Amino acid sequence: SPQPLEQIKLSESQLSGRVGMIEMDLASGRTLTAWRADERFPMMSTFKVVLCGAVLARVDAGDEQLERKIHYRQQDLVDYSPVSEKHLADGMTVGELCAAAITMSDNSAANLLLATVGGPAGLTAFLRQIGDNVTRLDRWETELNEALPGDARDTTTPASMAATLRKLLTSQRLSARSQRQLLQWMVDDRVAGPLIRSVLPAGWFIADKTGAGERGARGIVALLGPNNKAERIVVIYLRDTPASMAERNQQIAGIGAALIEHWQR
Ligand SMILES: OC[C@H]1O[C@H](O[C@H]2[C@H](O)[C@@H](O)[C@H](OCCCCCCC3CCCCC3)O[C@@H]2CO)[C@H](O)[C@@H](O)[C@@H]1O
Numbered sequence: 001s002p003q004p005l006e007q008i009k010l011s012e013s014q015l016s017g018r019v020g021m022i023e024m025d026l027a028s029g030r031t032l033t034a035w036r037a038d039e040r041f042p043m044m045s046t047f048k049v050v051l052c053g054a055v056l057a058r059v060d061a062g063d064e065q066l067e068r069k070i071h072y073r074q075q076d077l078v079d080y081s082p083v084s085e086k087h088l089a090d091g092m093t094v095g096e097l098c099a100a101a102i103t104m105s106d107n108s109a110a111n112l113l114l115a116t117v118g119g120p121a122g123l124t125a126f127l128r129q130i131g132d133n134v135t136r137l138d139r140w141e142t143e144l145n146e147a148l149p150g151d152a153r154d155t156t157t158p159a160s161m162a163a164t165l166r167k168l169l170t171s172q173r174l175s176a177r178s179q180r181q182l183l184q185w186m187v188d189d190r191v192a193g194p195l196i197r198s199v200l201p202a203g204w205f206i207a208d209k210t211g212a213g214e215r216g217a218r219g220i221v222a223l224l225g226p227n228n229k230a231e232r233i234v235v236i237y238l239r240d241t242p243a244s245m246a247e248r249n250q251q252i253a254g255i256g257a258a259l260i261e262h263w264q265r
């Protein structure tokens with residue numbers, strides 16, 4: 001494979017779309033690869049990691065409990081609710097909601113949680129509290145995936161999202177137990193985690209959250225490294241490409257292949 005930057009460029013050529021990418025050391029925050037790092041991309045379901053960071057901050061402060069059971073109604077549900085649609089009668093705990101949002105991309109679970117943090121505006125305020133002055137959430141599921149060309153709503157930048165993930169996972173803004181919980185939810189992703197493992201060489205750690213939207217939007221926020229260690233944050237977003245889902249997946253994986261082959265930088 002090409003060097004990572006050259007593979008990223010080839011992916012833009014091939015997709016006709018914009019790619020944004022950061023590769024960052026998790027422990028130190030060193031930026032390794034950066035491409036369109038300050039450009040905006042729709043977050044799509046990748047926002048759900050930040051969402052559950054805000055939930056966990058409430059838990060640490062004594063303002064929420066992961067045990068707390070939320071009852072909700074069928075008329076509340078939005079498109080794609082594989083877990084939450086099963087619990088109309090008995091409800092779900094806040095922690096179960098975060099697990100369904102992160103590990104199954106359950107959209108209604110995400111909206112229920114978003115309401116507990118004060119909606120898109122409240123999650124944006126949480127981002128500002130942790131020093132992310134760029135990432136913004138404006139809408140709920142599923143409109144936040146619309147990815148209109150040139151629309152700043154519901155966007156992050158690769159640099160912002162990488163720095164924010166690192167803050168949530170490592171900076172002691174969250175309690176030790178809450179940092180461990182957020183990481184385990186990403187480890188447990190069922191949407192893409194098993195598929196990624198099936199194509200990773202032996203020894204490579206993965207934890208992730210993926211997203212998809214209109215006009216080719218696609219993204220992943222992940223932890224990756226050899227020796228079974230979460231060594232680096234890797235954030236990749238794609239936008240404004242007409243390519244098939246399969247080809248967008250393949251191009252993201254090809255960037256991953258370049259990272260794996262040129263890991264020592
Ligand atoms: O197995 C050996 C091959 O390994 C790589 O090939 C990669 C390729 O670079 C990538 O483009 C493709 O993607 C196939 C699709 C994989 C889907 C999983 C990726 C993720 C990304 C975000 C969420 C969806 C799933 O995989 C092949 C391996 O099979 C090297 O590029 C190639 O030189 C080598 O010969």
Ligand SMILES: OC[C@H]1O[C@H](O[C@H]2[C@H](O)[C@@H](O)[C@H](OCCCCCCC3CCCCC3)O[C@@H]2CO)[C@H](O)[C@@H](O)[C@@H]1O
Pocket residue numbers: 001196199200201206220221222223224234235236252253254255256257258260261
């Ligand atoms: O020399 C390095 C390795 O090169 C190949 O591995 C291939 C592998 O066979 C293929 O399936 C993968 O596709 C890439 C799959 C990427 C999945 C991670 C993607 C995510 C993770 C983080 C966020 C962004 C994308 O590429 C690697 C590197 O060529 C050999 O198969 C393997 O024996 C060898 O150890």
